[PDB]
Each structure stands twice: as structure tokens, then as C-alpha cells.
Amino acid sequence: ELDQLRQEAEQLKNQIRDARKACADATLSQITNNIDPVGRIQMRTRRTLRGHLAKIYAMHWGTDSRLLVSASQDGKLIIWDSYTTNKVHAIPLRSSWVMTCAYAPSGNYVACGGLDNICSIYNLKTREGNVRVSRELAGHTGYLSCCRFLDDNQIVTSSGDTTCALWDIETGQQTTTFTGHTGDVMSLSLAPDTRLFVSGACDASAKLWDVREGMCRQTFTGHESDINAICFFPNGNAFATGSDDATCRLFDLRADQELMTYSHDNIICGITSVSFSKSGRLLLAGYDDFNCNVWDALKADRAGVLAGHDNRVSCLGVTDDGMAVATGSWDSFLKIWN
Amino acid sequence: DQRNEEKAQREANKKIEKQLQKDKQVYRATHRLLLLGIFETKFQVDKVNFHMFDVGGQRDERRKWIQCFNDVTAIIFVVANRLQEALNLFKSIWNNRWLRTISVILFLNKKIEDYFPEFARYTTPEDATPEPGEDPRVTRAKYFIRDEFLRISTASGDGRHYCYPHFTVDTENIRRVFNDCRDIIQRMHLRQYELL
């Protein structure tokens, strides 16, 4: 029974591999060769945000591209005014072992989580001025690697138990559990339309999920090591995935395949965090190399490098208006580059 | 206008920085210990604050969550076939890129030759502290196991981190953790000042 079924699975995998081959027409590495390169884009740190006492695992910009939240293992979420460097909030955590965070696009809530297997959502906007946890979205059976808000009442989380889940924040429950994967789920990126999201995992694969159903629409493979980070290309048809194999890979959802690898012979460091510029032309990826490369998303040229950190770069993201790149690191600083 | 908004934000910043500076004296003062073999345990020995993390809520896989324990003073590693698993875990931690600066306090609790044939040729290496009346075959086994862990610990790290094996009374065990942490901290400082 099992052998017949596993053989069927292999046949289906091969039919899919061939279906992908069937679409393996000229790709970006052949198509964009006649497109002027982005050149060498230098960025300088414009702002240094000091105050974390511990490594910073995650950040998320709100939609105003001014309020930035970052999470660190000193037990705090710090909401920074990225233009002035002033702290707005320094929110205590129930537990310091925090791996992720998210900022509601609205600025009303901030989320975080880690080894508690709880996504903790705070009310940033409250009459007392005291930021408190509104909900403890308990129920994961492993650590929270990543969370992202869809709305004030909806959050998608990724965890160490190999699943992702869409939570109803007010009722405090998973409404959709997105099962699949074999290893830990490491990263979420919501598509701009919040109908789709993509989830990276330690299976060296990423899945495109329909957030409205517990269904995987597409599985993307091509990685050889754990995926640590995903970001969508800003039109929702593609995403970049960072992994331990030091190759960031661009995938396209309609093509159902890898389009491009962003790698270099001199990089043997993994990718810990990825993001795109508003145009989708620049792909940024943070590494164990204590820097962030700014890849030409269409050509895979390396262009410039952001290298203000001494320790692992993680916690990378870009503002909604495309104005700035913020990176965190295990050195406990955020740096805003442009 | 916006000048009042800026004033207010600066005042808020000051309130926050002052609170973080207070918190900083607790954060740096309280030592973190990771326990292998999240449930936070807080304790104090001779007025030194420590807290230990029994990370028993994360399933079998360790690749990504042990990685978050990079600032830990020490990993408390508890042992007792199952030994090879403990040695392999110890080794992967020991050689982990992010845990390569963290010392390990090792607690060895509780036929060896069928799992470790080399044990048969093992001689208790002179320095031993058997209990009076303790069976020499047990003494031999305990030091053998201890040494296999040390063989791993002395293989790499270039002095960045050390293994502190102990055998196993919670009072004595916690006393050992304190003393091992004391040695861990002094060794870190001695290397910072290039005195070790």
C-alpha cells in the first residue's frame, strides 16, 4: 500500500518537474541582459537606532514608513521614530526569547513571538498610554519564527511545529491551520492583496498559501538548505527567498518555478533576511557575513553592499514608500540605509 | 504646531531611555543559562541572579531555536545508545557557528563496550574522585563518558569556550552551576584582556 502510494507521489513529482520544464523558456538571466544595470548603489546609514540590549531578531515598518518596530532578546519591543531616532515605545515582553514581530499596518497593534509558542499582540493605541498585551495567541506547538498582520483582527504566524496559522485575534483562535512542510516554518510574506501569502521553511522549500483556506496553492523548490526569509516582489507575482545555502532565489507564481539565483562565489554565508525595494528592482538580503547585499533583482548583479554591522544581520525590511532600508543585527542596533 | 509634537516626543524618549537604563542593570546582571535535557527557571546563588531555560516545548529539531541562545553564558547539558546521541548533540553545539563562544556545563547523571568498544581499553586517567566504597567499574565508566565529552570540547574553540563536566541533590548541583559560571565569566574576561 505504502510503496504503491510513494511511487505515485514520485510520479506526480516528476510530472510537476516536467510541467515546470515545459515552461522553462528564456528566463531573466537571458531576458534582462539588454537592460541597463542598476549600477553600484551605495547607501549610507542615515540613522542609527541605539537602545536594544540584546540581539535584534526582527523588525517591521508600519505603512507610514516612519514608525519602526524591532524585537530583541532583552525583553523589549522598541518602536522607533525612524526619522528622529526617538523611541516611542519600549514594550516589555512576557518572555525575552522573541524571534519575530510585526506591526499592524494601521499602527494600532504590534505583534511578537518566539519560544513561548505564543504570538503576543499588544494594543499600541490605548487610552491609558500603557501598551499592554491584548491577546496571547497561544496554540502553536513550537516557536514562532514569523508573524505578519493582515488586518487589526487577523494575523498569520509561522512556527517550529511546521505549520502556519491564520488567527482571529479577537477570539484568540486559529481559524485556518496551514499544514504541510516537514521542518520548521521560518518566514512569512503576505502578498500585497492579503489573499495570498508565502511561507518559507526548513525543508528548502516555500509554499504559496491561500490565506482563506488551509490550502497550499504552489510548492516552490530549488533551495538546498533551510529557508530563513521570504519577501514578495511588489506586484504579488513573485518572491525572493533567502536560505542557508547563501543563494537568494527569485520565484514566480505564475511560472511556478525559480527564475533567478542571487549568489556569488565569495559568499558562503547564509541569508537571514530578505526584502524588496518598492520597484522590485533591488533585492536586499542580509547575511551571516555581517552585511547586506543589494542585488539587482532582474540581473543578479551584486551592485552595492550595506555593511555597518559586526554581528549577524537579520531583521531586514523596507519602507512602504520605498524610501529606506532598515537592518538589524545581533549587535543590537538598527541601521537605516539610503 | 509640530514643535510641540517634537518636544513631547523628546520627553517620551527620555522616559524610555531612563527606564531602559534601569532595565539594563538587571539584564546585564542576570545570567542566562540554556538547558538541554519554554520553561523559565529563576534562581539566585550568593546574590547572583540567574535564570535557566528548559526548552522542552520545541520538538526534536534544534537547528533554529538553539541559534537564538547566542548570548547565553552557559548551556547546561544533561546526559542520562542515548550517550551517542548526547555526544552528537554536544558536538554539534560545540561546533555551532553561533554557539561557538558558549561554554557548556555538563551534568552526567545515573554494557558500555557494546556502544563504545574503546571503553574496554580505557584506563581511569589517574585523576579521579571516586566515592569511598564506589564500584571501580562505575568509576571507570563515569570517567570514560566524561572524557568522551571532553575529547569533543578540547578538539576546537581555541579557548573561546570550555566544558565543565560534573557528575550527578539540587543544592549541590546549582552550587556547581554558579561556580562553573564564575569560571566561565573569568575566562571570558581573561581572554578579552589577552591574559588566557
Epitope: 538546498e224 533551510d226 547564509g270 | 529539531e61 538553539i66 553545539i93
Partner: nanobody, 126 residues
């Protein structure tokens, strides 16, 4: 996609030998440390052996030292486990497993029950 396929299992008369191979694909085999994992029936997953990226250092479970040996041919993306003088005690499913990251020394979660970078394995009986 990462793929590891073991072959060469079967029933081997006690005291005999068996050559178990693992065909690897997808990943750049030459950048990874590789292991073998064993599941005796009724047991969890035991680590059996560890061969370095370059095929240099090799480590073994003490229980198999001198009885099982390993090698890798990077040019063929193939890992091998040569089992000599097999005992009934060695009945197990043998699995090919890769160490998570390229260019490393650590092998976390090899022998984890859900480790992703592992093959289906072959049943070896004695």
C-alpha cells in the same frame, strides 16, 4: 529540490556484508557534510556515521567502529556505507542524511524524526 535516495539494502546472512549507497541530487553535495542514520525496529533514530565535506575526517557510532565504514565520491554526488561482519543487532532502516547547511561543522537534527534532508532509507536485515 533536495533528494537523497538510498539503495543496496536487503537481507544479509549474519557475518556477511552489504554495500549501501546514497544517490544525492539537487544540492551541491561537495559542500555538505553527510551522515548515515539508523532505525532499528522498535527504536528511534541513531546516528551511525559522519563524513566531512571533503571526505576527510570520519566519525562513527562506537558500536559500529571497525565494522562499518564510509566514504563519499563527490564527483558522483554519492555517499556510501560499507557494512562488514553484520550482526542481527544491525537490523535497521538505514537512512542517508545531510547536515543542514553547506560549509559547516555542525549537524543539527540529523536523526530528528522529521528531519527534512533525509532519504527514505533502505531496510537492512541480518
Amino acid at each position: 529540490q533536495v533528494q537523497l535516495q538510498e539503495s543496496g539494502g536487503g537481507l544479509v546472512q549474519p557475518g556477511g556484508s552489504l554495500r549501501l549507497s546514497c544517490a544525492a541530487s539537487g544540492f551541491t553535495f561537495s559542500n555538505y557534510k553527510m551522515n548515515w542514520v539508523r532505525q532499528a525496529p522498535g527504536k528511534g533514530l541513531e546516528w551511525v556515521s559522519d563524513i566531512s565535506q571533503s571526505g576527510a575526517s570520519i566519525s562513527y557510532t562506537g558500536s559500529v567502529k571497525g565494522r562499518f565504514t564510509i566514504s563519499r565520491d563527490n564527483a558522483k554526488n554519492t555517499l556510501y556505507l560499507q557494512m562488514n561482519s553484520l550482526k542481527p543487532e544491525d537490523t535497521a532502516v538505514y537512512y542517508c542524511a545531510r547536515c543542514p547547511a553547506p560549509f559547516t561543522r555542525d549537524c543539527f537534527d540529523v536523526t530528528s524524526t522529521t528531519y527534512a534532508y533525509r532519504g527514505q532509507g533502505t531496510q537492512v536485515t541480518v
